[PDB]
Ligand binder design. Structure first.
Ligand code: P0N
Ligand code: P0N
Length: 164
């Protein structure tokens, strides 16, 4: 192992990402991309310039689990290869902001039952599973949450470390 993982997480910032469906998380895992609404896009762009690593921790609503976590490798950008997200009814892709490139650190699941001992000081000390899309997770809570995930032996953090 966990040493390179701990190195990547050092002095990182952490954000809870809530997806309405598994299909969008699968697309993010396959393509290394994420997009969010403009209020959260602005927060994440500020964070990306502010810290050595910005970590997104993903949870599909109603799943009772986190589906993994990833590190921002860029600020948001427009005009790239379009992403065939599952948009909610009535909503358009023009309501979205840019696309963030991300490097996955763990693609494994973690059930909320395993994180019940972790509370987030930035969300009223509620269990870390609770929070709106984009909620920041304080450093110690976010580090411990990431360390609870099963190790993802398919991932080599060597190339991630070199981007910092
Ligand atoms: C360094 C810091 C992020 C500062 O804020 C601390 C805190 C947050 C919310 C309520 C109480 C306290 Cl002590 C946690 N560590
Ligand atoms: C980018 C995505 C994974 C999919 O699209 C969602 C959306 C698009 C347009 C308006 C509202 C919403 Cl929620 C947000 N997350």
């Amino acid at each position: 192992g966990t040493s390179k993982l701990k190195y990547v997480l050092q002095d990182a910032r952490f954000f809870l990402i809530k997806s309405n469906n598994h299909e969008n998380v699968s697309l993010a895992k396959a393509k290394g991309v994420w997009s969010t609404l403009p209020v959260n896009e602005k927060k994440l762009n500020l964070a990306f310039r502010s810290a050595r690593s910005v970590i997104l921790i993903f949870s599909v609503r109603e799943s009772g689990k986190f589906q993994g976590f990833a590190r921002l490798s860029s600020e948001s950008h427009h005009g790239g290869s379009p992403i065939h997200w599952v948009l909610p009814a009535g909503m358009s892709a023009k309501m979205l902001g840019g696309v963030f490139k991300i490097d996955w650190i763990c693609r494994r699941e973690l059930p909320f039952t395993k994180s019940a001992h972790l509370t987030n000081p930035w969300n009223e000390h509620k269990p870390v599973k609770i929070g709106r899309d984009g909620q920041e997770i304080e450093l110690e809570c976010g580090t411990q949450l990431c360390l609870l995930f099963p190790p993802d032996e398919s991932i080599d953090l060597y190339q991630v470390i070199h981007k910092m």
